[PDB]
Ligand binder design. Structure first.
Ligand SMILES: [Cu+2]
Length: 297
């Protein structure tokens, strides 16, 4: 019934720091399949991050391309992401990302963001990637991904604390949140995500981004529903920096990401949602104190 797909780079070798390689893999069937596990084949000393997308039109036809060219032409739904030697990610029973079928993606696209060019003095060839475990047994609970991401953060040099706040109004069919992944680069201290319902903040996740950036389970899994606000804060420092630090594509720039894995009932399910905004900036007046206390490793 099941099968696995090994999505690995074809022996690539970067020639400069912060190089982004992308490749695609066709789903071997067109009928409906479900992704239930993710096993990364990758290490921090070479790879800054991987992202895995579902789509129907990959941005190029070659064995691999530079990701500046695009990931997918159509909507690239994020399935999975990885960074700091995170262990495998396994979905709760009855839950899988839905691919193939009339509705679903026919291609995976893998982005690998390689780190420092030191790791290739060697000139070795790289086969980093993910192995994915699909099943054709229909799952009643379809997983999707909600990405909260900052696009305007400036971290002035040396400032002890900078908060980066992300908030969107939730207006879709009910989702049920069960795991999360936080991401920053070297300046990030703690990253927190919340569901805010009538002034009451309900923790989704709180993690140190310097720990392996796994999909950690949501301690008390929670419904997010029409009318709610989803809110996240990354706490940064400017210490150890000469100039301002901007949001960017290299390991010396910053990023504030919260990835929330959710499920929905098959019939009304959505794959991928996005917040790159801060709609409700004064709402953070009452964010809990825990969002600015660091998690001591
Ligand atoms: Cu990054």
């Amino acid at each position: 019934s099941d099968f696995a797909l090994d999505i690995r780079m074809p022996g690539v070798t970067p020639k400069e720091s912060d190089t982004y390689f992308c490749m695609s893999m066709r789903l071997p069937v067109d009928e409906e399949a479900f992704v239930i596990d993710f096993k990364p084949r990758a290490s921090m000393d070479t790879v800054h991050a991987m992202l895995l997308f579902g789509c129907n039109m990959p941005s190029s036809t070659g064995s691999y391309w530079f990701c500046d060219e695009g990931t997918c032409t159509d909507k690239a739904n994020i399935l999975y992401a990885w960074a700091r030697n995170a262990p495998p990610t396994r979905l709760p029973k009855g839950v899988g990302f839905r691919v193939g079928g009339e509705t679903g993606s026919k291609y995976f696209v893998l982005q690998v963001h390689y780190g420092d060019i030191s790791a290739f003095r060697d000139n070795h060839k790289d086969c980093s990637g993910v192995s994915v475990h699909l099943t054709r047994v229909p799952q009643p609970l379809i997983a999707g991904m909600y990405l909260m991401m900052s696009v305007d953060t400036v971290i002035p040099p040396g400032e002890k604390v900078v908060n980066a706040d992300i908030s969107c109004q939730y207006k879709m069919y009910p989702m049920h949140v069960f795991a999360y992944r936080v991401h920053t680069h070297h300046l990030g201290k703690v990253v927190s995500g919340y569901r805010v319902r009538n002034g009451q903040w309900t923790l989704i996740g709180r993690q140190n981004p310097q720990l392996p950036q796994a999909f950690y389970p949501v301690e008390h899994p929670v419904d997010v529903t029409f009318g709610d606000i989803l809110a996240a804060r990354c706490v940064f420092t400017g210490e150890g920096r000469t100039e301002a630090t901007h949001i960017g594509g290299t390991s010396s720039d910053e990023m504030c990401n919260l990835y929330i894995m959710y499920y929905m009932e098959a019939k009304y399910a959505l794959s991928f949602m996005t917040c790159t905004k801060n709609v409700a900036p004064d709402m953070f007046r009452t964010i809990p104190a825990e969002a600015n206390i660091p998690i001591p490793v």
